[PDB]
Amino acid sequence: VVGGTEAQRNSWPSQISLQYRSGSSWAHTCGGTLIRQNWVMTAAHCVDRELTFRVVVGEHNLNQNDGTEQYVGVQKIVVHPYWNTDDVAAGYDIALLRLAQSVTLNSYVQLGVLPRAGTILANNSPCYITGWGLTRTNGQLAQTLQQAYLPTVDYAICSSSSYWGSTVKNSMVCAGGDGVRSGCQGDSGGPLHCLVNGQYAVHGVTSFVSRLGCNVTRKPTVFTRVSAYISWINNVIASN
Ligand SMILES: [Cl-]
């Protein structure tokens, strides 16, 4: 997250860290949202590689013992069937991970609330992106979970020529674009939390930023629209 602030430890309890095994250690690669005690929602592009993945819930500082972490293997990966790694702009950047064990809920570990199906946020709706992604374009991952206020940019504006054009689809949510704050590599898969009717819900799954850089004016961070996939998610969880 570029231009973020450190999140309080119990602010975003559904945020998880999706990590892969590298040597005798684990590396954070993406965020995700805990949606069931044994299911995580993340981006399909995060699980394109044939890696060994684990999920960390109750994580705050990737480099320090927080005393709240729960580490669980990923037992099954269900990527949206229309996902195409060669075309992130087509959308469908979403995947569900069945965890090997059910995690324990507490103030640091909670299920993310998802929007009702079809919900679209009004332009400029208040949201926060959270994650341990790069804190600068071509930078380094954060140690501590970051949050950045990223108001939505509606489809009409987001898909206009000076923004993302045809690259953005109505199955996505754009947010930010102020040139200061944004998602960045390593935030992928994580949530876009937006305040609606007093409650934060996870309206987006971080999907992509410009190839030019993370915080690029008029290139808001683009997220998979969670509300476009409610039926899909339910169908996956019910059959697995
Ligand atoms: Cl949360």
UniProtKB/Swiss-Prot annotation:
The keyword Repressor belongs to this UniProt entry's keyword annotation: no
Disulfide bridge partners, by residue number: 30-46, 127-194, 158-174, 184-214
Residue span(s) of domain Peptidase S1: 1-238
Location of the active site: 45, 93, 188
UniProt keyword terms in alphabetical order: Calcium, Disulfide bond, Hydrolase, Metal-binding, Protease, Secreted, Serine protease, Signal, Zymogen
Expression tissues: Pancreas. Basal layers of the epidermis, hair follicle and sebaceous gland epithelia (at protein level).
Protein name according to UniProt: Chymotrypsin-like elastase family member 1
